[PDB]
Amino acid sequence: TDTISILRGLKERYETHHGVRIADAAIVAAAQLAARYITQRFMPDKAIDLIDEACANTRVQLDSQPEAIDKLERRHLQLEVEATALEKEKDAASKQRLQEVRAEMARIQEELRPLKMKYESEKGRLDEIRNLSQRLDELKAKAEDAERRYDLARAADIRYYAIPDLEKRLAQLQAEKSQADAERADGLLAEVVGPDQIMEVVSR
Amino acid sequence: DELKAKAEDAERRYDLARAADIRYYAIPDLEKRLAQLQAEKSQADAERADGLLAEVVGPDQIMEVVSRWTGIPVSNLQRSEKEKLLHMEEYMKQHVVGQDEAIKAICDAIRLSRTGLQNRNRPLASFLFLGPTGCGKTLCVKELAAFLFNDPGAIVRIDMSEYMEKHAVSRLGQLTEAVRRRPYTVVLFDE
Amino acid sequence: SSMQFTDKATETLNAAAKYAAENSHVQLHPSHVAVVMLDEENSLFRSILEKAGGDVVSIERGFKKIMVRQPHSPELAKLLHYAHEHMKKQRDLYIAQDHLILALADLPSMAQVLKEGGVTKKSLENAVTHVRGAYEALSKYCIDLTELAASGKLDPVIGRDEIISRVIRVLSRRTKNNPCLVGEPGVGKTAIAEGLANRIVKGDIPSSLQKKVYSLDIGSLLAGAGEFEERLKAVLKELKEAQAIVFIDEIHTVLGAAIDAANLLKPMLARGELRCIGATTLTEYRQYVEKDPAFERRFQLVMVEEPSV
Amino acid sequence: VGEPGVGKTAIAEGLANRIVKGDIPSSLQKKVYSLDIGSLLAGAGEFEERLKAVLKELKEAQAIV
Amino acid sequence: SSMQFTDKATETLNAAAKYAAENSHVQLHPSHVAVVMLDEENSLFRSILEKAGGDVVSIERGFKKI
Amino acid sequence: MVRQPHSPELAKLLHYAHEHMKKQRDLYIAQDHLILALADLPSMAQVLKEGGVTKKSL
Numbered sequence: 001t002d003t004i005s006i007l008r009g010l011k012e013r014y015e016t017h018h019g020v021r022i023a024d025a026a027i028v029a030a031a032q033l034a035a036r037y038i039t040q041r042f043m044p045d046k047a048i049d050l051i052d053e054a055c056a057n058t059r060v061q062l063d064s065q066p067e068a069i070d071k072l073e074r075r076h077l078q079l080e081v082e083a084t085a086l087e088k089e090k091d092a093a094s095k096q097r098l099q100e101v102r103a104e105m106a107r108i109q110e111e112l113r114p115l116k117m118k119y120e121s122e123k124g125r126l127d128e129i130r131n132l133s134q135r136l137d138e139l140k141a142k143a144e145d146a147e148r149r150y151d152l153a154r155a156a157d158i159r160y161y162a163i164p165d166l167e168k169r170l171a172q173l174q175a176e177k178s179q180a181d182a183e184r185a186d187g188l189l190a191e192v193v194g195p196d197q198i199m200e201v202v203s204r
Numbered sequence: 205d206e207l208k209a210k211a212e213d214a215e216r217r218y219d220l221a222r223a224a225d226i227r228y229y230a231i232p233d234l235e236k237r238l239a240q241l242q243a244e245k246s247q248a249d250a251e252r253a254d255g256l257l258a259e260v261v262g263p264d265q266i267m268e269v270v271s272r273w274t275g276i277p278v279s280n281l282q283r284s285e286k287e288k289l290l291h292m293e294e295y296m297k298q299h300v301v302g303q304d305e306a307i308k309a310i311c312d313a314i315r316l317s318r319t320g321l322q323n324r325n326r327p328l329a330s331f332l333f334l335g336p337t338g339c340g341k342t343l344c345v346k347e348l349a350a351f352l353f354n355d356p357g358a359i360v361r362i363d364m365s366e367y368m369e370k371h372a373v374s375r376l377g378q379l380t381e382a383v384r385r386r387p388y389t390v391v392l393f394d395e
Numbered sequence: 396s397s398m399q400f401t402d403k404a405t406e407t408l409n410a411a412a413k414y415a416a417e418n419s420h421v422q423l424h425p426s427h428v429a430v431v432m433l434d435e436e437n438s439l440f441r442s443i444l445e446k447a448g449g450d451v452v453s454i455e456r457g458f459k460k461i462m463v464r465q466p467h468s469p470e471l472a473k474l475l476h477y478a479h480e481h482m483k484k485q486r487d488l489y490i491a492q493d494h495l496i497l498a499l500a501d502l503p504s505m506a507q508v509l510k511e512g513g514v515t516k517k518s519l520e521n522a523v524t525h526v527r528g529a530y531e532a533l534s535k536y537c538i539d540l541t542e543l544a545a546s547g548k549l550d551p552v553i554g555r556d557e558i559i560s561r562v563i564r565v566l567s568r569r570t571k572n573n574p575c576l577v578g579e580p581g582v583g584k585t586a587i588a589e590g591l592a593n594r595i596v597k598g599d600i601p602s603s604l605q606k607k608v609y610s611l612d613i614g615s616l617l618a619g620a621g622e623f624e625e626r627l628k629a630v631l632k633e634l635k636e637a638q639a640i641v642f643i644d645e646i647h648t649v650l651g652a653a654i655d656a657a658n659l660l661k662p663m664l665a666r667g668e669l670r671c672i673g674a675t676t677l678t679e680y681r682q683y684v685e686k687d688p689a690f691e692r693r694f695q696l697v698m699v700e701e702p703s704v
Numbered sequence: 705v706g707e708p709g710v711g712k713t714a715i716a717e718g719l720a721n722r723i724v725k726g727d728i729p730s731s732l733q734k735k736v737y738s739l740d741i742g743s744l745l746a747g748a749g750e751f752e753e754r755l756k757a758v759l760k761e762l763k764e765a766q767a768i769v
Numbered sequence: 770s771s772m773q774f775t776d777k778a779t780e781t782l783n784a785a786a787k788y789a790a791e792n793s794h795v796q797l798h799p800s801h802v803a804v805v806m807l808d809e810e811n812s813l814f815r816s817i818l819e820k821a822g823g824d825v826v827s828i829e830r831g832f833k834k835i
Numbered sequence: 836m837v838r839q840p841h842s843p844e845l846a847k848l849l850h851y852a853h854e855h856m857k858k859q860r861d862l863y864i865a866q867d868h869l870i871l872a873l874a875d876l877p878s879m880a881q882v883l884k885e886g887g888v889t890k891k892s893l
């Protein structure tokens with residue numbers, strides 16, 4: 001019970017650095033599995049590492065692309081250069097191979113572009129979410145020192161004309177994120193750190 | 205090889221003006237000459253009726269390097285592991301006679317570990333030779349590495365004359381480090 | 396013949412043109428070089444002039460008034476020609492930050508401000524004598540792995556998909572952001588980091604990681620003298636303002652020891668301002684990392700298993 | 705005193721988050737310094753001379769370490 | 770009687786003699802020391818004027834007139 | 836050498852060595868130091884031009 005209260009205190013800072021969505025189900029499941037399976041260290045060192053490792057793995061799918069998508073993109077790059085190189089040649093054997101490369105690239109563009117561009121548009125939006133959390137957590141810390149060092153001309157421009165202005169931008173990006181998740185058949189585990197994400201770290 | 209390196213550097217440093225003349229001109233126009241010389245060279249080597257494996261690295265070329273860095277003849281390298289387990293009972297009887305009931309028991313403990321009828325938690329075969337002295341305890345070990353291991357000199361002998369004390373138990377370590385350099389070794393436990 | 400400039404001296408003219416671009420300018424004047432050098436951390440242009448005396452404030456304000464009167468400048472072409480002609484005159488020492496002071500003294504437009512400020516021409520001779528005896532230190536003492544990887548001069552890495560993907564997850568964490576390829580001298584340790592730099596240019600790395608890869612040469616830092624503190628502190632300073640990940644081959648030899656060199660890497664790896672990738676042997680790993688409890692807090696055990704058949 | 709895993713440095717971190725905010729009067733407020741053994745060993749012996757200057761400043765300024 | 774100097778104050782004293790000789794002077798006025806000492810990277814004298822009060826851009830202007 | 840009767844031209848050559856001691860990079864001030872110094876004189880660089888020695892290639 002004491003381990004759960006420790007992870008809840010640093011939940012705001014861990015969500016800022018990683019940038020994923022940390023839920024309440026991953027906190028209880030982390031302290032429960034750390035006292036039955038992985039048991040060789042001490043709390044909270046044997047419980048905090050289970051959260052930072054699970055949140056770091058989710059960052060790959062939220063920015064890069066899985067192996068099932070990256071493998072298809074590498075095959076299209078090798079066919080684009082080969083189709084152009086064989087076009088300049090006037091050999092009889094190059095004309096037959098050119099008809100098969102152009103017919104294969106038409107099927108790739110109909111399946112890779114509607115899937116790869118979804119992660120590209122999300123990358124430009126998900127990266128802005130982390131930039132908002134890094135600045136909102138910094139303004140709340142810089143304005144706190146002004147209240148203890150006798151400075152009213154500095155804290156008045158942060159708690160009023162900085163934090164309330166940058167807070168409305170975070171609420172607008174959360175509404176557009178749920179719309180893009182429906183077009184990718186993801187959202188229940190690909191961007192939410194829950195009990196299933198913590199169990200994958202212990203099992204490996 | 206150098207043109208492929210300069211072509212990839214221009215495409216990664218945002219320069220599509222120099223790499224367009226390498227991957228599309230300097231390379232497609234030179235692959236026909238390189239492939240033509242390799243085809244005419246392979247056809248001319250067959251007319252000489254000798255030196256067929258002197259230009260193409262094949263299975264016989266790799267066995268020549270291994271046979272030189274050790275001393276094992278070439279005839280022992282082409283023998284696969286499947287054919288050794290079949291003609292094993294006929295080779296042991298030519299050197300060790302009289303123990304007809306002991307040779308069959310050795311092959312019954314090795315064949316059950318190579319096919320896949322046992323878990324991967326035990327070594328090859330753990331034996332325990334007994335009987336009086338001079339019955340075939342040392343000669344049988346030397347004949348095992350001369351057929352299955354193809355190396356009679358790869359048999360270590362750790363006698364219990366100096367490792368009987370309790371202070372020498374941790375060096376079983378000298379035996380751990382010795383078997384790491386040579387995987388296929390024969391550890392003999394005398395006395 | 397041909398002149399050779401370092402990466403720090405090359406970016407000096409680029410950084411000077413960036414500051415002049417915001418003030419609406421079409422040419423690059425040599426006076427912008429002295430302004431950039433006076434806005435760095437622990438610069439050498441200030442300590443050298445302090446020995447000869449004079450007033451730097453009167454000189455700094457004089458150089459800032461020249462760039463305002465501005466409408467490649469004709470005066471800048473004489474500076475590049477002097478760097479090529481005087482490149483075979485003195486003795487040892489190549490080009491750096493202290494050698495650029497004598498190049499600006501030969502210009503008639505820059506010598507008038509110095510004489511009217513304090514430090515004359517004769518004072519500049521005795522000032523550079525006592526001080527005598529990728530960026531600048533990242534080119535001669537370090538080798539950028541991403542440069543050779545993008546130039547097609549790196550061997551392909553096939554068969555390390557289960558190891559490279561694990562290092563990316565370690566670098567994305569808040570704590571223990573210092574991987575250590577713990578293995579054996581024969582299973583492959585340097586070639587593992589070679590495949591990581593290939594995914595940086597291609598874009599397969601997540602957005603949370605955008606640094607570079609620099610191979611820290613141990614034998615290059617021990618070239619010559621005493622004078623090892625001036626070479627080790629110069630590498631750590633260039634990696635802090637540029638934000639890059641340095642690669643250290645065989646960390647058990649440089650971290651844990653003749654000349655004390657591991658003391659300059661402890662405060663950097665503790666504050667999160669440095670990311671190192673280790674690749675030592677398990678035999679020496681239990682005597683230089685697991686022995687000190689402070690080193691285990693920042694390094695994570697990464698086992699390297701030998702591939703099968 | 706405890707096992708290397710229960711937390712030692714984090715215990716001293718909570719002390720600075722209570723005296724600065726509000727707990728003890730200003731007559732007992734003392735600064736907390738983190739003396740690192742790697743910073744004094746660096747450089748040029750001269751290891752004992754750099755340590756004496758640190759212990760002298762901690763007395764006239766009234767602060768713990 | 771003995772006089773012992775350090776390192777930071779030693780380089781400043783030697784720099785004041787070179788500044789008074791390059792401008793053709795006779796006497797060594799004490800105003801030729803605070804100008805060279807102030808022109809230092811992270812100098813200890815800069816934090817003194819900023820702590821006890823007073824602008825650092827107006828005090829140095831009064832030393833050049835001497 | 837035939838037209839020959841310190842020197843008026845040697846005093847100018849010694850003036851270049853006084854400034855070349857504080858420059859950038861080279862070798863050791865000795866026999867090879869005066870090699871790259873005679874090319875600056877107009878009365879000595881004319882022979883190198885007609886013989887095939889470019890000032891930029893020196």
Ligand SMILES: Nc1ncnc2c1ncn2[C@@H]1O[C@H](COP(=O)(O)OP(=O)(O)O)[C@@H](O)[C@H]1O
Pocket residue numbers: 299300301302303336337338339340341342343344
């Ligand atoms: N089956 C056999 N037929 C003939 N000679 C044998 C046989 N087995 C062993 N020997 C002889 O015994 C000798 C080795 O004896 P060894 O095995 O060392 O005795 P011990 O088992 O008492 O140590 C060899 O020189 C070999 O000629």
Ligand SMILES: Nc1ncnc2c1ncn2[C@@H]1O[C@H](COP(=O)(O)OP(=O)(O)O)[C@@H](O)[C@H]1O
Pocket residue numbers: 550551552553554555579580581582583584585586587
């Ligand atoms: N995936 C791979 N593909 C090709 N070569 C590899 C691969 N992994 C390792 N190697 C080879 O293993 C060698 C490892 O060298 P290095 O790590 O410097 O020292 P050590 O040999 O002691 O590990 C490299 O020279 C490299 O050629």
Ligand SMILES: Nc1ncnc2c1ncn2[C@@H]1O[C@H](COP(=O)(O)OP(=O)(O)O)[C@@H](O)[C@H]1O
Pocket residue numbers: 006009010044045692708709710711712713714
């Ligand atoms: N009450 C707590 N709340 C939040 N975090 C804690 C708490 N107690 C300990 N920690 C964390 O545990 C870690 C312990 O670090 P430290 O004691 O320096 O070394 P080690 O990790 O080896 O124990 C700290 O980084 C701290 O973030």
